[PDB]
Write a protein that binds this ligand. Structure first.
Ligand SMILES: [Cl-]
Ligand SMILES: [Cl-]
Ligand SMILES: [Cl-]
Ligand SMILES: [Cl-]
Ligand SMILES: [K+]
Ligand SMILES: [K+]
Ligand code: NA
Ligand code: NA
Ligand code: NA
Ligand code: NA
Ligand code: NA
Ligand code: NA
Ligand code: NA
Ligand code: NA
Lengths: 92, 94, 92, 94
């Protein structure tokens, strides 16, 4: 968690999710929790059962995916290392 | 043989048990549907349904971030340590 | 296309998609084209707007994902190399 | 500078144009919706809708297999050649 590389990826991920939450809650009229949910399932590629209704929201979502998918998967990978390492080091 | 593979297998199993319990309690799904939802979420396939409760939405966000990395680490190790050697062995003329 | 590694991945992918098409068209009652579509969008993780209705179909789908996702992405990667190489070699 | 990146960018753009034309003609989508569908399909996010015509289903299957590899090759090159250097530059104290 002290690893600056992990810390920066965390910050970038949080900032990207905040931006999506603000966007979808104000332009697409979603409750904050639903805007955050939509942002997360979009950038992790899980998807969900809704899509943006406005043209602005569709264009934003296209750009958001290309801006954010690589960072989010970089963060998920670094997070996975941190989470599994204590179990690996106990199982040695 | 591979202790990292052992860890990822056990952690994957525990992660899917946790999701099965969570979605069957909080989202009211039958256990098999809760397991299905957990699997398609963490492999990023996705489901035709989404959580309905705010607790379910929050949990799912955290489950995604922790669970994708573990499940795909397991899938990668399964491919290199189990599936690839089996394919190669099954291609040998005997 | 003569690369045996690519050829084997193609065969494995086709056989896996045939199995899913047979399964979903007979157990989940989908038309063949819809059963193939469901099999493809599942193993590529795109997803779609339906899910299996039977418990047997849900269990099959879980196992199908773990049996098939790695092969399908291996094939997609090898296919991408083949498809882009003529353009790379013309752009040198 | 990177000719592989140039190729993947152009092929990605052409792939998305092709999908926009296809889904707006065959599936009747407005152009922006056809582009949206193409992007979420090839990045594997998925859409709340699916093709309705058999032509659309067949095309989508082929588009997925050819398009995922190109779009994710482009995303990887964008990350290593553009986004990573920019982040690093923007972290330098000046
Ligand atoms: Cl909220
Ligand atoms: Cl059950
Ligand atoms: Cl059919
Ligand atoms: Cl339009
Ligand atoms: K996906
Ligand atoms: K998906
Ligand atoms: Na989706
Ligand atoms: Na979806
Ligand atoms: Na969906
Ligand atoms: Na989905
Ligand atoms: Na889905
Ligand atoms: Na879906
Ligand atoms: Na849906
Ligand atoms: Na989807």
């Amino acid at each position: 968690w002290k690893d600056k590389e992990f810390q920066v990826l965390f910050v970038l991920t949080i900032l990207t999710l905040i931006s999506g939450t603000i966007f979808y809650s104000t332009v697409e009229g979603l409750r904050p929790i639903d805007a955050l949910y939509f942002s997360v399932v979009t950038l992790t590629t899980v998807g969900c059962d809704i899509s943006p209704q406005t043209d602005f929201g569709k264009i934003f979502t296209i750009l958001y995916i290309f801006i954010g998918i690589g960072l989010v998967f970089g963060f998920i990978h670094k997070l996975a290392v941190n989470v599994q390492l204590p179990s690996i080091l106990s199982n040695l």
